A paper describes a structure:
We selected a noninhibitory antibody Fab fragment to facilitate cryo-EM structural analyses of XlHAS1. XlHAS1’s cytosolic GT domain interacts with two N-terminal and four C-terminal transmembrane helices (TMHs) and three cytosolic interface helices (IFH1–IFH3). The IFHs surround the entrance to a curved channel that ends with a lateral portal halfway across the membrane, formed by IFH3, TMH5 and TMH6. IFH2 contains the conserved QxxRW motif of which W382 is pivotal for positioning the acceptor sugar right at the entrance to the transmembrane (TM) channel. The XlHAS1 architecture is consistent with an AlphaFold (AF)-predicted structure of human [name] and HAS2 and the previously determined CvHAS structure, with the exception that TMH1 is clearly resolved in the XlHAS1 maps. This curved helix rests against the cytosolic connection of IFH2 and TMH3. Although the loop is unresolved in the apo XlHAS1 structure, its flanking residues T485 and Y503 at the C terminus of IFH3 and beginning of TMH5, respectively, position it right above the catalytic pocket. Although only the loop’s backbone is resolved in XlHAS1’s apo conformation, it is evident that the loop lids the extracellular channel exit in the absence of HA. XlHAS1 was expressed in Spodoptera frugiperda (Sf9) cells and purified using immobilized metal affinity chromatography (IMAC) and size-exclusion chromatography (SEC) in glyco-diosgenin (GDN) detergent. On the basis of SEC and cryo-EM analyses discussed below, the catalytically active enzyme is monomeric.
HA consists of alternating N-acetylglucosamine (GlcNAc) and glucuronic acid (GlcA) units and is synthesized and translocated across the plasma membrane by HA synthase (HAS), a membrane-embedded processive glycosyltransferase (GT). HAS integrates several functions: (1) binding its substrates (uridine diphosphate (UDP)-activated GlcA and GlcNAc); (2) catalyzing glycosyl transfer; and (3) translocating the nascent polymer across the plasma membrane. HAS transfers the UDP-activated glycosyl unit (the donor sugar) to the nonreducing end of the nascent HA polymer (the acceptor sugar). This reaction generates UDP and elongated HA as reaction products.
Author numbering:
A (entry chain H): 3 to 126
B (entry chain L): 3 to 108
C (entry chain A): 15 to 171, 194 to 331, 340 to 486, 503 to 568
Write the structure that this text describes.
Amino acid sequence: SEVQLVESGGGLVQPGGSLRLSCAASGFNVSSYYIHWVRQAPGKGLEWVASISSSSGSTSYADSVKGRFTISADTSKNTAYLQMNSLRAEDTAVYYCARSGYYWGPYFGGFDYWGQGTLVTVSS
Amino acid sequence: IQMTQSPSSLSASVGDRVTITCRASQSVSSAVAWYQQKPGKAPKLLIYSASSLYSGVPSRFSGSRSGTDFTLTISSLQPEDFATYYCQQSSSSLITFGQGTKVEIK
Amino acid sequence: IPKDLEPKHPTLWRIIYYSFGVVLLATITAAYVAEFQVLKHEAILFSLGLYGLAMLLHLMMQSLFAFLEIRRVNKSELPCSFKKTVALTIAGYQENPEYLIKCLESCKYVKYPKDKLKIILVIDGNTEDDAYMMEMFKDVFHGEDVGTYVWKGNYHTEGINMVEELVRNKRCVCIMQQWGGKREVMYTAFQAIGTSVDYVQVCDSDTKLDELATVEMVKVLESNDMYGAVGGDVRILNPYDSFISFMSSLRYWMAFNVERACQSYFDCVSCISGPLGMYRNNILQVFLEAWYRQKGDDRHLTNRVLSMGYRTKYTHKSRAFSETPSLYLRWLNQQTRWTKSYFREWLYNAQWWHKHHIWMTYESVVSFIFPFFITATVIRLIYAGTIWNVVWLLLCIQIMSLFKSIYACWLRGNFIMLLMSLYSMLYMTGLLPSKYFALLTLYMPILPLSIWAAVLCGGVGYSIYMDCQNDWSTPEKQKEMYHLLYGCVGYVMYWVIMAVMYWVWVKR
């Protein structure tokens, strides 16, 4: 009905720097839903980055994402934050913050109510 | 640990049934979802949990499974159907996405 | 994946268990028949006391095996991995809004993680006047994935696909259906669960759940893979609602603690409480089709679990507050239904005794054969001809209850268990005729009570007649009269003290 997700923080940064993207949700609480970050490189398909479930502490990262990225959520501000440090050349892409349900068994529900991404440029 | 969208390309006329097949290495306790993305816009979910259809999707997208293979079929190629179709296997601590499968026109 | 299980040598263990049961029954029959030849009305105290010491030894054995299990479960520690999902299935049939909202709040405030807790509520609605339950369910959560369906018929005559997808995909599900009793909603919930979860907890629409109950059930179920079902300690939310309420609470505490801990020491818990129970989804799915077509009890599900080859447990760290009937003859109807379910199953478990410990066979044999022997002894003692016999029979019954209450007080550590002595009067008047009527069946409940009262009064009158037939002016009756008067005054003083302490502990 009114569920939406708006993320910001994208921009141009020097390689090896730091960035902090933030997606704020409207119409629902992030504590009852999963929050995932999806990156789509220019000219390539979607790639998963990280996922977090607030009120439980369950955080997951990709193999090429682990060791440099951190994911967090804040219920008071109802906003999910993704911090990146020591960024490499292959990080310039569009980052999407999308909500979903719970995993349970073999029934998930899919990634519903996506949000328009923001551009990140890690170059000199 | 990896997935393969077999067609990776398609070019059919309107009103022609098309099928997109996705192969996953493991499907023990993971769900497969099919999304649609148009250029310049975020992807839109079509069919959840392999066969279930999402609310608002027209009754022309059919999802099925045959073990390690998952098929999405469009009975008729409506004008608002040419986009990029993505196959995603969702699971805890590991989420994988498909690639390619862009439906062109002819 | 799970299948029926059998021991390594089914024939040897079967033969051993049947031989043990037959030998026990024959031994009991021998002593009662031996008792009639060895002693007559001449030594009633010897005739009864021997039996009292028998019950007392059985009670001490049960208490020891319960205390050992309690100490073992308290000493043992195992941190929860929180990697197993739990689905709470609730049944609704025209429930009171306050009790239902309390149950929903308790289920929503469990300490278990949100991402590993699914909630399903199935209602016997399908009408407009049942929409309040769905509305209350919607307003209670209002935060997670809520899926509500009205439906136009149960599973046995599309809404089936919608129900299945809503249950297996969302977190909070509220499904109403055509009224088919409490079995239909449980079957629908279990069928819609599918393979989404691995642990399923069953709850009713009138229970209050503790925060750590689900965590404790998960912890005890994750300790061993052979466990298939588990239960918890069920308390009473209204211990002071009526006189029968406090007695019901005391009986619930004693039964649950002693019996279930003793059975868990041998992993042979006979019955798992409906309001508080957890089952393996993989085992539950296999017996689900068979259970529905049986010709929805909590003693039947436990019997199916036991017959599947797996063992059931019980932990006292999982607590819940249920309710008990407060209006008379309703507890009697509940007891009659419980007796029918117990008997129709004493018949089920007589088949697979070899699949568990010998304690299951011993308990079943003694529980089946004792009430009849007690009834026969009571009838023989009353139909003797001396007020001495009946007076000392009543005195010995009250003494047995007094030592039972004292042992319960020592075990619990609280002195409130001494008030359980009124259970003797409760059972000696209502429970035995209800059990007999239930056995014969397989207002209505007032007939067995009237029959029991009539036969008891006739026996007392016959004894009084035979006693006054002999002249009491003889010098062989003065001592008997003195002893009878002293025993009667002692009984009156004991009953007065019982009632006085009851009123003191209730009024304050």
